[PDB]
């Protein structure tokens, strides 16, 4: 209850979350330690500082009227609470693919520039974090306008969600499902970043004179900050500045009520009319939900930054770290070949679930990684050296049959090795999903760890297939293709 008590707990929180990384074996333990401090603070606070009297949908009429007054499209769709995605837009007439059905002028947007010109301007002008991080500045812009009853953006803010499914909102046992995955470190970083930021700014707001007129000085809870950054990370957009020279981050009212489906980006910024413009990704008949394609993100990115898991994500991928070792006798030649091909000697590549499993850059890396000294010479010397480097990412022009067989043997072995580092198997994951009754957040975590393994399992099978094809080419003494 005591103001000085919370200031001491946040001081303790700031110190804990500013300490260096503990080492990957100690990150789960540090995670629980930070969760313990945050939850103690949160349980001593009163939740969201500003709550509204009516239901969420009570405010959609005001948003439409406010958008209409400032030149946005307001006809042809309605807001509906869908079970799968939450609230979304639904067509009230037939909308044809490529029809411009949605447009939002810049004056309705919340941007880093509107942050600078608002009540947050003075604090923004002197705080090193706000000036450097538009995403955080937009989170505080959103909180300041939320706690301002005469704010121009109130019709937008009163329609925002009150809760999200970012991992910031998960229970400890819900995140525990992700132990041993690739994704869980970023869950840890998100939680530590948010806790450090809340404690830092809580102290800044309570002492800095450029914050004496901010509504947050009277009340700024951890729940406030968790809501604000989750609002920004699930909804923010990059748009050009008015003069088109630079980019900024923005919240786009009305348009950000659309939920995600597979497809192509059909929203662009119209600089001439100074407005966001969305054209229909597909035909939407009257009564069908209107979807857009958010972007080619992985399910790890959708879970951690967008708060949902997308079934049948055609762009799902996992990471695979690979590098030429300096203990390799051919390190110098491989490094130079990679360099001439625009590829680092060590990098984080992706494995994809859809065809093809490996990108051009990863194929080229794997070919060089397995090259003999004579092959490397052919890529460094003579009048065809540059032509050979030009084709290194092309699956149709192998270096040699033996090179392919070695690289697909390596990828199969490494993908198999990675699979064995997970604390569960794929069949075990499918059994948990089939035989246990799980919350939405729990299923997101289990489906994420399942997806990582299914991508590695598909890489193992594809590499086995490819290895056999090129071994057959070898034994058949087939003529190597030439470009």
């Amino acid at each position: 209850v005591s103001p000085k008590e919370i200031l001491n707990l946040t001081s303790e929180l700031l110190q804990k979350c500013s300490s260096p990384a503990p080492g990957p074996g100690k990150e789960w333990e540090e995670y629980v330690q930070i969760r313990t401090l945050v939850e103690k603070i949160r349980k001593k606070q009163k939740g969201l500082s500003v709550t509204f009297d009516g239901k969420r949908e009570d405010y959609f009429p005001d948003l439409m009227k406010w958008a209409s007054e400032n030149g946005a499209s307001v006809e042809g769709f309605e807001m509906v609470n869908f079970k799968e995605e939450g609230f979304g837009l639904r067509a009230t007439r037939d909308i044809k693919a490529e029809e411009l059905f949605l447009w939002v002028p810049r004056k309705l947007l919340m941007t880093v520039e509107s942050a600078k010109n608002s009540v947050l301007g003075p604090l923004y002008s002197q705080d090193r974090i706000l000036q450097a991080m538009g995403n955080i500045a937009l989170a505080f812009h959103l909180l300041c306008e939320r706690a301002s009853p005469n704010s121009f953006w109130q019709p937008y803010i009163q329609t925002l969600p009150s809760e999200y499914d970012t991992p910031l909102y998960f229970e400890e046992d819900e995140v525990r499902y992700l132990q041993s995955t690739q994704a869980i470190h970023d869950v840890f970083s998100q939680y530590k970043n948010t806790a450090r930021q809340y404690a830092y700014f809580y102290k800044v707001i309570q002492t800095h004179p450029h914050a004496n007129k901010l509504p947050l000085k009277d009340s700024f809870t951890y729940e406030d900050y968790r809501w604000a950054v989750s609002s920004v990370m699930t909804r923010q957009n990059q748009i050009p500045t008015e003069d088109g020279s630079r980019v900024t981050l923005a919240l786009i009212p009305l348009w950000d009520m659309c939920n995600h489906t597979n497809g192509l980006i059909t929203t662009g910024y119209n600089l001439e009319d100074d407005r966001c413009e969305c054209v229909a990704l597909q035909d939407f008949r009257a009564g069908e939900q209107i979807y857009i394609f958010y972007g080619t993100r992985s399910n790890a990115e959708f879970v951690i930054h967008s708060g949902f898991f997308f079934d049948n994500n055609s762009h799902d991928r996992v990471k695979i770290k690979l590098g030429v070792s300096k203990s390799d006798r051919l390190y110098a030649m491989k490094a130079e070949v990679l360099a001439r091909a625009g590829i680092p000697t060590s990098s984080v590549f992706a494995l994809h679930f859809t065809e093809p499993p490996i990108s051009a850059q990863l194929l080229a890396f794997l070919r060089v990684f397995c090259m003999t000294e004579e092959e490397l010479k052919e890529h460094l010397l003579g009048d065809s050296a540059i032509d050979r480097i030009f084709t290194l990412g092309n699956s149709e022009f192998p270096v040699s049959w033996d090179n392919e067989v070695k690289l697909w043997t390596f990828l199969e072995d490494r993908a198999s090795l990675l699979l064995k580092t997970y604390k569960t198997t794929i069949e075990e994951d499918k059994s948990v999903l089939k035989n246990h009754d799980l919350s939405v957040r729990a299923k997101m975590a289990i489906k994420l760890r399942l997806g990582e393994k299914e991508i590695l399992e598909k890489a193992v099978k594809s590499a086995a297939v490819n290895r056999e094809y090129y071994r057959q080419q070898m034994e058949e003494k087939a003529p190597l293709p030439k470009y």
Binding site: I136, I239, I252, I265
Partner: peptide
Amino acid sequence: TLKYPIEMGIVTNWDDMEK
């Protein structure tokens, strides 16, 4: 085709200590 494609929920860096 689009000169300014807009990605909904584009991923940003939140690590203030890196930046």
